[PDB]
């Protein structure tokens with residue numbers, strides 16, 4: 001079982017040149033609880049963004065180039081990424097855009113945070129046709145003193 005997890009603003013924006021213009025510590029907590037003790041596959045740019053291995057997770061990094069950090073596992077293909085996760089109940093694909101695009105057709109679950117933020121970015125979560133996906137969980141949150149925007153956690157499972 002392969003799952004994708006992603007935080008989407010408007011227009012499914014997930015990434016931009018600079019740090020996202022928001023502070024969403026609840027979404028970070030959601031990402032951690034949904035990824036903890038699972039293998040995480042990410043692309044090299046997301047690996048760079050994160051800065052260090054996600055603790056408590058087997059970290060698998062996709063790059064066409066040789067790896068540059070022996071703390072994590074580097075693979076050169078989608079299939080090698082999956083294989084490098086081993087035999088687990090659930091692989092979490094944590095982005096970014098090129099990685100999500102390649103893993104979405106493989107995935108059985110999506111964990112999406114829909115953030116009510118108007119941002120320009122160069123990177124978008126893929127179109128998922130909702131005839132393919134059933135929303136099994138939905139939880140909306142207003143912005144508050146810790147969270148700059150309203151956001152909604154959703155889990156979809158593939159039909």
Ligand SMILES: NC(=O)c1ccc[n+]([C@@H]2O[C@H](COP(=O)([O-])OP(=O)(O)OC[C@H]3O[C@@H](n4cnc5c(N)ncnc54)[C@H](OP(=O)(O)O)[C@@H]3O)[C@@H](O)[C@H]2O)c1
Pocket residue numbers: 015016017042043044045046047062063064065075076077078095096097098099100102122123
């Ligand atoms: N014109 C564009 O918009 C464009 C096009 C490409 C990239 N970018 C820039 O990259 C940033 C974020 O991109 P992202 O979120 O898409 O990054 P991402 O998915 O986190 O990382 C992408 C990197 O992962 C590796 N990768 C992904 N799939 C692979 C595969 N099947 N086999 C081998 N390696 C694989 C490649 O690493 P290596 O590079 O080490 O091979 C690729 O460059 C953006 O700020 C964006 O501007 C932009």
Ligand SMILES: Nc1nc(=O)c2nc(CNc3ccc(C(=O)N[C@@H](CCC(=O)O)C(=O)O)cc3)cnc2[nH]1
Pocket residue numbers: 005006007027028030031032046049050054055094095111112113
């Ligand atoms: N829902 C969701 N929110 C996200 O921010 C998110 N981010 C990514 C990719 N980028 C990142 C960047 C940093 C960390 C990160 O450092 N998380 C730490 C908590 C430490 C912190 O507070 O920064 C973790 O342990 O998961 C994770 C993913 C992928 N899916 C997402 N999914």
